[PDB]
Swiss-Prot record, chain A:
Provenance organism: Salmonella phage P22 (Bacteriophage P22)
Protein name, UniProt field: Portal protein
Location in the cell: Virion
Subunit structure: Homododecamer. Interacts with the terminase large subunit; this interaction allows the packaging of viral DNA. Interacts (via C-terminus) with the head-to-tail adapter protein gp4; this interaction participates in the head completion. Interacts with the scaffolding protein; this interaction initiates procapsid assembly, thereby ensuring incorporation of only one portal ring per capsid. Interacts with the capsid protein.
Role this protein plays: Forms the portal vertex of the capsid. This portal plays critical roles in head assembly, genome packaging, neck/tail attachment, and genome ejection. Procapsid assembly may initiate with a nucleation complex composed of portal and scaffolding proteins. The portal protein multimerizes as a single ring-shaped homododecamer arranged around a central channel. Switches upon genome packaging from an asymmetrical conformation in the procapsid (PC-portal) to a symmetrical ring in the mature capsid (MV-portal). This change of conformation may serve as a signal for headful packaging.
Family per similarity comment: Belongs to the p22likevirus portal protein family.
Residue pairs linked by disulfide bridges in the UniProt entry: none
Domain of life: Viruses
UniProtKB/Swiss-Prot annotation, chain B:
Quaternary structure annotation from Swiss-Prot or TrEMBL: Interacts (via N-terminus) with the capsid assembly scaffolding protein (via C-terminus); capsid proteins and scaffolding proteins form building blocks that assemble to form the procapsid. Interacts with the portal protein.
Annotated segments matching region Binding to the capsid assembly scaffolding protein: 1-53
Span covered, complete protein: 2 to 54 of 430
Gene: 5
Protein name according to UniProt: Major capsid protein
Domain of life: Viruses
Result of altering D13A: Impaired phage growth; inability of the mutant capsid protein to interact properly with scaffolding protein
UniProtKB/Swiss-Prot annotation, chain C:
Function in brief: Forms the portal vertex of the capsid. This portal plays critical roles in head assembly, genome packaging, neck/tail attachment, and genome ejection. Procapsid assembly may initiate with a nucleation complex composed of portal and scaffolding proteins. The portal protein multimerizes as a single ring-shaped homododecamer arranged around a central channel. Switches upon genome packaging from an asymmetrical conformation in the procapsid (PC-portal) to a symmetrical ring in the mature capsid (MV-portal). This change of conformation may serve as a signal for headful packaging.
Superkingdom in the source lineage: Viruses
Record note on quaternary structure: Homododecamer. Interacts with the terminase large subunit; this interaction allows the packaging of viral DNA. Interacts (via C-terminus) with the head-to-tail adapter protein gp4; this interaction participates in the head completion. Interacts with the scaffolding protein; this interaction initiates procapsid assembly, thereby ensuring incorporation of only one portal ring per capsid. Interacts with the capsid protein.
Protein name listed in UniProt: Portal protein
Gene giving rise to this polypeptide: 1
Organism: Salmonella phage P22
Covered residues, full protein: 5 to 49 of 725
From Swiss-Prot, chain D:
Name the UniProt record assigns to this protein: Major capsid protein
Listed result of changing D235A: Lethal. Complete loss of procapsids assembly
Originating species: Salmonella phage P22 (Bacteriophage P22)
Involved in capsid stabilization and maturation (site feature) positions: W52
Description of how the protein assembles with itself and partners: Interacts (via N-terminus) with the capsid assembly scaffolding protein (via C-terminus); capsid proteins and scaffolding proteins form building blocks that assemble to form the procapsid. Interacts with the portal protein.
């Protein structure tokens, strides 16, 4: 928490407003599609 | 030997980075952004009040 | 090559691509919610 | 007065040579850096010795190369004005006239390059209607010289007549007092045949250039000169720079009256068999490519001599002339009269290097650029338009970038009839 | 024109290009408009070491 983060501020300086917040951070989601290993077990009850 | 063949010249596109700068002062200074076309080249000044004594 | 470099390159591409639509949308939200008079150069002269 | 948009069509051209020549489009990214020139190797020739004890006599290797580069764009810049009603109907047809003009210009460049760099020369002492089957003899001479020199003709061969000599050939065919199938075709139409005397395509090309007579006389080689095959040489900085194989600079007594495209032949040198190195009976013929300085010229088939003793064996492997230049031999001129040329070649001797003009980039924003196909010939250029700051006007530019290269001047030929006087 | 983002500092500029058909060329311009203003000079300070007469 000591290192205050900064990012591209998405808001604009609204002149008639006393106070605007100054802490910004970003959450970057990315999706990767790949072929991963899958195991075909045998069910001790029935089926696989 | 004397393989007096054909001579070319190669250019590889693995650049060699040489410059690496930092801007702590500009990162620490607070950035304010007026909306869209708020102020033009002619009039861009702004007057802000000073806390009263 | 830096992971941050790649992330920020993608973010900069998207940010600069969706710029005018975002600013028009922000203008519409302000016009509909705060004030219909965004005349800020004047209103002070 | 009533203008009536009923176009009186007036011209109709054709571009056989340009539509027949092979086209090459090297990678643009590499050709930007390589100064718009690229190098291509040449088929290797091997020296040969016979004996049992060959110690200290092991030859090296040597592979020659040729350089192909490009010229400057050929544009059709013109200015379009709305509010005219005469620049409204004229623009639609100006675009088409521009396309036809660009195709014609490409064909003209191809024909001129072939005619002024064709090393093989077939000269005749009179016109074509002088004797019977004289046009056949004219074509068969070219075929015979190609066969004797043993030049690569797998891709094909082609002979282009001008209209005058094509008509003379047809007249010769019809005068025969016998009508089979060839005389009847040469009667009903002007065609002689699609294949004559062994060539795979015998056409007539209306834009064949005329090779003007040469007023060069009394010229001799100035000092003995030995030309050696090579693939590169050291520059002033110690770097190795490649060497073009299709040129040789000779020092003459006086190069007055010569010009680009003069056909010459030194007295005493003869063609070889290339592969077998057997001496032909024909005089070796060369073509003047450049008149540099006042006592030097640049002839296209480098005269590597067979009897040269300064040639290392792998260099002597490329010999195409029986004897070098002997410091006083007369250089005879083969084009003694003005004559429109008939041009024969192997189909893989002329190429048309092409490049794009990337005007669709983000940099050229504000001007609208599309592709533009040049008809007949297989080439693609740009068509760009941009309006003016005001006044409801515009500008149009149709651009095309290419360069006509003759990679095998020894395989390109020229036919000069009526070379008397 | 289009927007142009600047690294490190959180500023936005403008990226404009133009094409000339006569010379078949292109101009590119990147412009950045900002002002660094010190609203409290009494709060900004400076340290000078080694100030011998």
């Amino acid at each position: 928490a000591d290192d205050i983060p900064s990012f591209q501020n998405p808001n604009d300086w609204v002149f008639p407003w006393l106070t605007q917040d100054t802490i910004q951070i970003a959450e970057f989601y990315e999706v990767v599609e790949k072929k991963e290993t899958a195991f075909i077990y045998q069910d001790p009850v029935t089926g696989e | 030997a004397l393989n007096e063949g054909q001579i070319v010249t190669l250019a590889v596109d693995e650049i060699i980075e040489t410059i690496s700068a930092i801007t702590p002062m500009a990162q620490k200074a607070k950035k304010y952004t007026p909306p869209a076309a708020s102020m033009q080249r002619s009039s861009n000044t702004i007057w802000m009040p000073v806390e009263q004594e | 090559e830096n992971r941050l470099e790649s992330i920020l390159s993608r973010f900069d591409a998207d940010w600069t691509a969706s710029d005018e639509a975002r600013r028009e949308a922000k203008n519409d939200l302000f016009f509909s919610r705060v004030s219909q008079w965004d005349d800020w150069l004047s209103q002070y002269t | 007065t009533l203008a009536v948009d009923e176009i009186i069509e007036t011209i109709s051209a054709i571009t056989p040579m340009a539509q027949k020549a092979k086209k090459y489009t090297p990678p643009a990214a590499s050709m930007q850096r390589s100064s718009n020139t690229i190098w291509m190797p040449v088929e290797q020739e091997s020296p040969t010795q016979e004996g049992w004890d060959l110690t200290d006599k092991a030859t090296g290797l040597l592979e020659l190369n040729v350089a192909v580069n490009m010229g400057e764009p050929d544009n059709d810049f013109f200015q379009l004005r709305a509010d005219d009603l005469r620049d409204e109907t004229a623009y639609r047809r100006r675009i088409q006239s521009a396309a036809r003009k660009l195709a014609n210009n490409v064909e003209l460049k191809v024909a001129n390059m072939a005619a002024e760099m064709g090393s093989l020369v077939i000269t005749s002492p009179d016109a074509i209607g002088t004797n019977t089957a004289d046009a056949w003899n004219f074509v068969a001479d070219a075929e015979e010289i190609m066969f004797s020199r043993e030049l690569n003709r797998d891709m094909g061969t082609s002979y282009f007549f001008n209209p005058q000599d094509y008509k003379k050939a047809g007249y010769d065919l019809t005068k025969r007092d016998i009508f089979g199938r060839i005389p009847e075709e040469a009667y009903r139409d002007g065609t002689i045949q699609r294949q004559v005397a062994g060539f795979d395509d015998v056409l007539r090309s209306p834009k064949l250039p005329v090779l003007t007579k040469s007023t060069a006389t009394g010229i001799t080689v100035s000092g003995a000169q030995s030309f050696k095959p090579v693939a590169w040489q050291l520059d002033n900085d110690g770097n190795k720079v490649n060497v073009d194989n299709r040129f040789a600079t000779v020092t003459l007594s006086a190069t007055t009256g010569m010009k680009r495209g003069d056909k010459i032949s030194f007295a005493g040198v003869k063609f070889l068999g290339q592969m077998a190195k057997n001496v032909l009976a024909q005089d070796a013929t060369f073509s003047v490519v450049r008149v540099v300085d006042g006592t030097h010229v640049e002839i296209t088939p480098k005269p590597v001599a067979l009897d040269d003793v300064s040639l290392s064996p792998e260099q002597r492997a490329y010999a195409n002339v029986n004897t070098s230049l002997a410091d006083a031999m007369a250089v005879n001129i083969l084009n003694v009269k003005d004559a429109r040329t008939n041009v024969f070649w192997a189909d893989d001797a002329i190429r048309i290097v092409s490049q794009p003009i990337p005007a669709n980039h983000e940099l050229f924003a504000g001007m609208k650029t599309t592709s533009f196909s040049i008809p007949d010939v297989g080439l693609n250029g740009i068509f760009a338009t941009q309006g003016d700051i005001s006044t409801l006007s515009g500008l149009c530019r149709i651009a095309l970038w290419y360069g006509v290269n003759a990679t095998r001047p020894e395989a390109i030929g020229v036919g000069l009839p009526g070379q008397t006087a």
